[PDB]
Design a protein around this ligand. Structure first.
Ligand SMILES: Nc1ncnc2c1ncn2[C@@H]1O[C@H](COP(=O)(O)OP(=O)(O)NP(=O)(O)O)[C@@H](O)[C@H]1O
Ligand SMILES: Nc1ncnc2c1ncn2[C@@H]1O[C@H](COP(=O)(O)OP(=O)(O)NP(=O)(O)O)[C@@H](O)[C@H]1O
Ligand SMILES: O=c1c2ccccc2ncn1C[C@H](O)C[C@H]1NCCC[C@H]1O
Ligand SMILES: O=c1c2ccccc2ncn1C[C@H](O)C[C@H]1NCCC[C@H]1O
Ligand SMILES: [Mg+2]
Ligand SMILES: [Mg+2]
Ligand SMILES: [Mg+2]
Ligand SMILES: [Mg+2]
Lengths: 478, 482
């Protein structure tokens, strides 16, 4: 099914991968796509995880409206907003905006529900769709005009507590990516120019696509401080009587996560799905031809299914009579099912099953008896091993450097760069403009993050010459 | 403020509005027909959602997300005043306007035509959870009828009608369970009339509910045997075993956040909401009998212990350990919210190894040893759940008057009752009955068919249509409706 090579035309391979796997169907409204069951079930897995996890922090789900009136919304973002002007042929008395994000919808309610210290912390989240008329090239999952996300918005008595929630959420994004999707990410802070301008400090969790050198933002979690509180009058009264503004966080993650998974683990044969989010972990394929024991094969397959299910192993028997076994191999292969269990006559009175692991192609003869624990063994190996190879690929792709003249060759090898920087407002804008100048002539490099994990700083700013403050990862991005 | 004061029988619209606001379910919003759903209500949606979702996954139905936008061209393939149209992004105009999805047939069925080429692709069984938008003409009502609502819409395609029908009824059964097992609301399975069915389909099935306080029937959910006309329209065909081109047989079905509203209305009383245990965010609220600046730690300590013990039985619990408020205040607070069980722990209870438990629906109190709490609160919840249902089933059936003749109509409607009547099912008849009960109500409002129930009461030979006097075929349930 898949004929483009990941390492040759990466955009075509991507498109082939997501289409031939049946994850995505193309659509006539530019920048929008149909998520098919095979993609959708993966979303449900990660949604269920994060949701359970934030529930344990006392976050509660809600649903606020998708419309916001012009007046409330309009108290680089403006061009993106979709506006409803009519119902039927009738013009609205005033046009209304489809929500691009929900601060202006939720925060007036907050000012109202928060009167007393008794009322904090207020922690809410919502799963919804968001619409932005994106100017950049859209890409299925990574950047779409309608996407699905969660946005979580909290308010607290103290900077201390809100900040602690910020890091807690960021940890859960690392887990969404690293634990669920086996995609390695790097926690850090955003530069003053990349952060959410309505907040005090933006934390982020950053990913990398080796095949085009692009960094990509996996998720984000903001300490908002008191700015939105003053703007929206979210004041509260302490236990000593005084009238203080609240300290807020907000944080979101999207269907982009799926796109990043697909890009990280995919190969020339198509998708490869980490076991932890695969709706089919093991596919069973009865081998049938010239009528050899047709009934005996099928009967065992059902025994094995109930078997493996005793272990919470998600199993599907590909039982369908209208497709050949070779067809079934290719299908589940392109779909990225982690384990294929093949079973014909030879393996019937042999008491075994052949099992092929999607990541490497390695095959195992395994006795009916040893399967459940040996598949559990393998599924952990697949999952651990996808993450590990990816962390290695990520680290091969970051060059540590000290001087500006190292930049372009790193960027030409499609690598990020870790460099000491004075964290000056202008330097970043200058660096973008110049890296564009050089790329045009041969592409803008930006700040991706200031990582939490700072190496030792014995040192001059790699661009300005000034005294450098911290190590900052840069690159081309999405 | 604190409590519900409008009486439920006597001031129904206002009771409703009070209960959903005071209880913290809903917050008003500046765009009409749209409302904020706070945790206290959202949790209930999450509950019915997981329930339904799990059941359809068992039937092999699979979830998807198709876009909320649809091109004007694709939407008007073949309601229009209800559609919301996007014309601009920022200051820039679109080449053509783009509609926000009002329902997804015109988005999904061209995709179905692509994906179905052969009998091996069948059956195709998809669902989606999404919001839907319609500029409703009628007065909006939180939950019951909103301009943004949440739903689930299912759309399947099959090789044979028989299989499609089997699914229509399976799904309809799931809707009965959604309302009856989850929400403790009784419903009546039935066939829509020719006039009230989905014009796009062969046969529409439904579950209908009844709201006694105002006498009006209300469609709780719907499941259609679509037949082959959409496949004809959208060119959804398949090559069968012998290479012949055939049209698929379709179903579609939906259920919305309306369900939360029908529940609220069914079990509420003058104190406010009453939430069935299967869906309540908090099932047991623990209320320590404390007062201002008393914090010895004995009582809270034991509340925290009790919570751990009940949580080990999967009971959902909250301790209301707030300082500025009395127990009496707290009692009322959680009654208004409809927490089904309140566990009271005072110094006196601490002294006996005992707690006092009061159940929201009846107010009956129980003294219970700490040891027994888990096993006795589980029993109590099953009893509340079941009692809410059985009492509402009875109010449903006491609200239905069987009748023989058209003269029995208006008296039955003025009692805020529905009517079950032998009906000849001829089409103009229904419209005549609408017009005629409309006019007769202004002079004192239209009665429409709600459903032809599956549960048909007996029909003696030679029975005649209550309205035309022609021979009656079956009983039809009629009333005022939402
Ligand atoms: N079009 C999109 N499709 C999918 N995910 C997106 C899209 N746009 C943004 N996201 C993700 O949504 C996350 C939270 O939203 P937000 O922080 O507002 O992003 P953002 O500032 O718009 N990113 P960017 O568009 O590059 O400026 C972002 O960190 C992105 O990873
Ligand atoms: N405004 C609304 N808010 C919430 N739920 C609704 C609303 N309108 C319809 N529904 C429910 O959605 C279910 C399935 O949708 P659908 O069959 O399209 O409704 P409908 O034909 O528009 N009913 P009606 O609007 O009364 O003519 C219906 O059976 C209703 O119970
Ligand atoms: O505020 C906007 C925004 C507003 C209008 C149109 C497009 C937008 N794009 C992005 N943003 C910033 C983020 O939406 C802010 C914040 N939202 C809640 C959680 C994610 C975080 O990015
Ligand atoms: O088709 C429409 C419709 C179309 C445009 C504007 C408003 C509409 N209101 C209702 N309907 C009919 C329902 O959409 C039919 C169908 N919807 C999804 C599946 C359930 C079934 O009721
Ligand atoms: Mg953006
Ligand atoms: Mg940005
Ligand atoms: Mg309607
Ligand atoms: Mg109707």
């Amino acid at each position: 099914m898949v004929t483009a090579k990941k390492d040759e035309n990466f955009s075509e391979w991507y498109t082939q991968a997501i289409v031939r796997s049946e994850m995505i169907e193309y659509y006539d409204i530019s920048g929008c796509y149909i998520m098919r069951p095979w993609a959708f079930h993966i979303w449900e897995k990660v949604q269920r995880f994060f949701d359970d996890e934030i529930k344990k922090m006392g976050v509660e789900n809600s649903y606020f409206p998708m419309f916001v009136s012009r007046h409330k919304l309009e108290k680089g973002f403006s061009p993106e907003v979709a506006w409803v002007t009519h119902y039927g042929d009738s013009p609205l008395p005033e046009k209304i905006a489809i929500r691009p994000t929900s601060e202006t919808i939720m925060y007036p309610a907050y000012a109202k529900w928060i009167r007393s210290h008794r009322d904090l912390p207020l922690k809410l989240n919502q799963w919804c769709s968001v619409v932005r008329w994106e100017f950049k090239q859209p890409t299925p999952f990574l950047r779409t005009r309608e996407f699905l996300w969660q946005e979580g918005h909290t308010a607290h008595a103290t900077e201390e507590e809100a900040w602690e929630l910020v890091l807690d959420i960021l940890e859960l994004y690392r887990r969404w990516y690293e634990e669920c999707l086996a995609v390695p990410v790097i926690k850090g802070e955003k530069s003053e120019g990349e952060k959410f301008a309505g907040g005090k400090k933006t934390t982020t969790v950053e990913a990398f696509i080796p095949e085009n050198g692009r960094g990509i933002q996996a998720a984000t979690s903001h300490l908002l401080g008191t700015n939105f509180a003053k703007m929206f009058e979210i004041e509260f009264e302490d236990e000593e009587g005084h009238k203080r503004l609240v300290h807020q966080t907000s944080w979101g993650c999207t269907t982009r996560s799926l796109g990043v998974m697909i890009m990280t683990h995919g190969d020339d044969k198509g998708l490869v799905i980490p076991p932890r989010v695969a709706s089919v972990q093991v596919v069973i394929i009865p081998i049938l031809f010239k009528d050899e024991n047709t009934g005996e094969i099928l009967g065992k397959c059902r025994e094995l299914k109930t078997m493996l299910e005793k272990a919470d192993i998600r199993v599907r028997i590909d039982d369908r009579s209208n497709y050949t076994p070779g067809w079934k191999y290719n299908h589940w292969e392109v779909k990225g099912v982690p384990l294929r269990l093949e079973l014909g006559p030879k393996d019937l009175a042999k008491g075994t099953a052949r099992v092929v692991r999607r990541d490497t192609g390695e095959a195992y003869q395994i006795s009916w008896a040893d399967l459940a624990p040996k598949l559990l063994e393998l599924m952990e190996g697949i999952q651990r091993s996808l993450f590990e190879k990816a962390k290695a690929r990520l680290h091969e792709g970051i060059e540590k450097i000290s001087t500006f003249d190292e930049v372009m060759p790193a960027l030409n090898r499609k690598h990020l760069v870790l460099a000491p920087w004075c964290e000056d407002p202008e330097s970043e804008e200058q660096i973008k403009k110049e890296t564009q100048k050089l790329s045009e002539i041969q592409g803008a490099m930006k700040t991706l993050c200031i990582p939490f994990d700072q190496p030792p700083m014995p040192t001059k700013c790699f661009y300005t010459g000034k005294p450098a403050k911290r190590w900052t990862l840069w690159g081309r991005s999405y």
